[PDB]
Amino acid sequence: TSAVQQKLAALEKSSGGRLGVALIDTADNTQVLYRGDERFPMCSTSKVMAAAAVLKQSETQKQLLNQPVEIKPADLVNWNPIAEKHVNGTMTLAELSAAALQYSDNTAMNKLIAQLGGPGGVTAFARAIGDETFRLDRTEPTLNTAIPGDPRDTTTPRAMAQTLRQLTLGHALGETQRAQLVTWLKGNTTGAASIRAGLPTSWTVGDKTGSGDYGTTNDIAVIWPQGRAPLVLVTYFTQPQQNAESRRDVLASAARIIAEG
């Protein structure tokens, strides 16, 4: 019930939905949590785990990121902004990872899942790095159904914040791979209205957004304030109505509240 809690609780109450927040400050390893142990549909934020797991593979298969992967008409799903540009051609695994992370391409995510042996291979990597909460159960696009109470394709804010810190600031990946993940997250094109919109102008951000049914609107971010040790912030949001519209403003507002405490 620190000052931020009542403020985050008030934001949630004004929003009509369910808000989950987890912050980690690497300067002193303290944490702020709001519904930190409740499950939320991850939606596209799970693409970070899949991309990281492929990077882990490339620590042994050194040229793996350069491997071409055919894009067939049957591979296309519901949102394929980059993969649709390469049907009947190829994209490398690096290009598929970038398309997944920076444009939220769902065909690209499915190629990453396939490279890992299915959703259980993404969950396997989460276990290998100490995340016992993350579970990926479906491919795209069905992982976004975001049905209330459904444990499939969920994690908690606390678990995802620890994971993102290990991948981007810790040593869960090789240094080359960590740098590549950071470059990918910083190049994200879909995050301008989410966590980034609630943070000071001078802070560098890498993030992955998520969106799904029930108005589910998510963002997970690694944040470098200037003259200060980096931060990790997860903001998850979902709504009672299956048809609810996106609420990226809630994530911006949560980030601003966090950034003010």
Chain centroid to CA 33: 17
User: What contacts 3, CB < 8 A, 6 or more positions away?
Assistant: 261
Interatomic CA distance for residues 234 and 159, integer angstroms: 10
Q: What is the largest CA-CA distance in the chain?
A: 55
Question: Around Cβ 19, how many Cβ atoms within 10 Å?
Answer: 25
Per the DSSP assignment, residues forming a β-bridge with 237 are 19
Per the DSSP assignment, residues forming a β-bridge with 236 are 20
Block residue for tokens 């350069």: 66
Contact 240, 148 (CB under 8 A): yes
User: What contacts 52, CB < 8 A, 6 or more positions away?
Assistant: 125, 167, 172, 173, 177, 181
Q: Please, what's the b/e burial string for 60-74 (b: 16 or more CB within 10 A of its CB; e: otherwise)? A: eeeebbeeebebeee
DSSP string covering 128-154:
HTT-SS------TTGGG---TT--TTE
Burial of residue 98 (number of CB atoms within 10 Å: 0-12, 13-18, 19+): buried
Token pair, residue 204, equals 């560098």
Question: Around Cβ 6, how many Cβ atoms within 10 Å?
Answer: 11
Contact 83, 72 (CB under 8 A): no
Q: Determine which one of 2, 15, 44, 194 is catalytic.
A: 44
Interatomic CA distance for residues 127 and 142, integer angstroms: 23
Interatomic CA distance for residues 238 and 40, integer angstroms: 7
Q: Is the dihedral of CA 254, 35, 135, 153 positive or negative?
A: negative
Resolution of the experimental structure, in angstroms: 1.4
Closest to 87 measured CA to CA, from 64, 69, 110: 69
Interatomic CA distance for residues 119 and 138, integer angstroms: 6
Per the DSSP assignment, residues forming a β-bridge with 210 are 218
Question: Homologous superfamily of 3-260 in CATH?
Answer: DD-peptidase/beta-lactamase superfamily (3.40.710.10)
Interatomic CA distance for residues 63 and 222, integer angstroms: 27
- Per DSSP bridges, beta strands 154-155 and 89-92 are unpaired
Block residue for tokens 């799903």: 77
Distance between terminal CA atoms of the chain?
13
Contact 179, 64 (CB under 8 A): no
Q: Is 202 a catalytic residue?
A: no
Closest to 14 measured CA to CA, from 224, 253, 198: 253
User: What contacts 178, CB < 8 A, 6 or more positions away?
Assistant: 167, 168, 171, 172
Q: Name the residue ranges covered by the structural domains of the chain.
A: 3-260
Q: Is the dihedral of CA 153, 35, 221, 172 positive or negative?
A: negative
Q: Determination technique for this PDB entry? A: X-ray
Contact 78, 165 (CB under 8 A): no
Interatomic CA distance for residues 123 and 109, integer angstroms: 14
Token pair, residue 244, equals 């609810």
Measured CA distances, 254 to 13, 91, 154, 189 (Å): 12, 37, 20, 20
Coarse DSSP helix, strand, coil percentages of the chain, rounded to the nearest 5 percent: 45, 20, 35
Secondary structure class of 228 (helix, strand, coil): coil
Residue type, 194: S
Per the DSSP assignment, residues forming a β-bridge with 253 are none
- Per DSSP bridges, beta strands 216-224 and 204-212 are antiparallel
**Using only C-alpha atoms, what is the Rg of the chain?**
17
162 phi/psi in degrees, rounded to 5: -60, -40
